[PDB]
Design brief:
dimeric, Capsid protein p24 (chains A, B), Non-ribosomal Peptide Synthetase Peptidyl Carrier Protein, Chain A, HIV-1 assembly protein, homodimer, capsid, mainly alpha, viral protein
Amino acid sequence: TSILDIRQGPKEPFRDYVDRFYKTLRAEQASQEVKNWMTETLLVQNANPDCKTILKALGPGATLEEMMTAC
Amino acid sequence: TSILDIRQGPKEPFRDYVDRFYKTLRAEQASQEVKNWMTETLLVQNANPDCKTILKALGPGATLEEMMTAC
């Protein structure tokens, strides 16, 4: 579970970050249920300071489209 | 999913940290499969600097008893 090392670059676009996050989860064969928990957690925690602050402001329970918009 | 806020105190014993991590997951009704991913990830990432460094040294794929021993 190297998912821990998938972090958002300082100037990396959230989109690019999201692509590499979910590609890693596929490899690690995560179930849709695992994919749900990781989005509410790890996706949010491994993002850059700004996005992480915006996503943490959106609240627990935001759709991926909401998070993208926010960043 | 407030699991993000369950973090290890600066001098809090790992055991105490582990109790509050898994109690929160129960409330959030996490499945055993969700409980598995969170241990390899969030449990490790929300620990204090020392433990986080030890657990990150143990490698991805360590049992909970191994992580406790390590801290």
